[PDB]
Each structure stands twice: as structure tokens, then as C-alpha cells.
Amino acid sequence: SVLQVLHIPDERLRKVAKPVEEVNAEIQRIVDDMFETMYAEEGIGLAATQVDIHQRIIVIDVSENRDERLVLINPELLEKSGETGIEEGCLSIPEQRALVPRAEKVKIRALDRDGKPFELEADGLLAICIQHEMDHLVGKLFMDYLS
Numbered sequence: 001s002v003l004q005v006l007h008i009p010d011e012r013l014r015k016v017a018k019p020v021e022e023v024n025a026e027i028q029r030i031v032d033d034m035f036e037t038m039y040a041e042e043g044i045g046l047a048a049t050q051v052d053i054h055q056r057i058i059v060i061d062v063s064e065n066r067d068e069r070l071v072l073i074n075p076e077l078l079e080k081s082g083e084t085g086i087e088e089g090c091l092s093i094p095e096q097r098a099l100v101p102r103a104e105k106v107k108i109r110a111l112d113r114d115g116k117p118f119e120l121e122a123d124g125l126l127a128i129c130i131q132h133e134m135d136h137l138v139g140k141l142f143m144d145y146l147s
């Protein structure tokens with residue numbers, strides 16, 4: 001399915017991520033669909049959030065530990081190791097290029113898509129790629145980040 005957030009005929013009108021405290025309905029698709037993406041993407045670059053107001057449950061499936069198709073967040077964070085940026089130039093008109101993001105490994109004090117607060121580290125090319133997504137937007141280095 002992939003997370004089909006919208007832009008330009010949308011209302012983002014410059015969207016950032018609006019941290020994770022609670023859950024709604026769409027949230028499932030952020031997890032469930034970031035699985036469909038985090039796994040079927042790692043190529044073009046989406047921008048993890050942007051239709052109207054936001055939240056951010058991230059994902060992982062048997063990725064760091066001997067877990068299941070679990071989740072990671074962008075929450076109320078605790079640790080933030082290294083920085084990198086991806087060579088994209090994404091969202092709200094994904095033209096131009098840049099390395100907006102700046103993350104390597106990042107640990108959270110978050111919440112999943114149940115409404116249950118979870119503290120975990122998010123690592124790997126995807127943690128950096130889905131945050132990429134929203135590090136294109138909330139990690140903002142770029143310029144206009146074509147928003």
C-alpha cells in the first residue's frame with residue numbers, strides 16, 4: 001500500500017511531525033504502512049508525515065532484536081547518536097536535492113500504535129530513512145525543503 005500522505009493538493013502547508021503522546025485511527029497506517037514502506041521503499045524517499053496535523057509511530061519488523069513487526073517512534077527522545085542525512089530532496093514538492101536529516105542511531109521514550117508508551121533505540125538505514133522522511137521535514141537543514 002505504502003504510506004500515501006499528501007502534498008500540494010493537500011494542507012501540510014509546511015508540515016513538521018507533531019510528537020507522539022497518544023494514538024488515533026490513521027496511526028495504524030503510519031505503523032502498518034511504514035511496514036509496507038520501510039520494507040518496500042528504502043529507495044525513493046517518502047516524507048513520514050504531512051496531510052494535516054501529526055503524529056509519528058515508526059516501524060521495525062524483527063530488525064534490531066528478535067522482535068516481531070514492531071514499532072519505533074520520533075517521540076520525546078532521549079539519545080541521538082551520529083548524523084548523516086540522505087541524498088534526497090523530498091516532500092511538499094519533492095524536487096531539488098539535499099541531506100536534510102542528521103541521524104545515525106536515536107533512542108526514544110515514545111508510544112506505539114496501541115496507546116502504550118515505549119522507550120527504545122531506533123537504528124539502521126531505515127530508522128534514518130523513515131526519520132529521513134521526516135528529517136527532510138522536521139530535521140530541516142535544506143532551505144525551503146520545497147514546502
Ligand SMILES: [Zn+2]
Pocket residue numbers: 044045046086087088089090132133136
Ligand atoms: Zn527522500
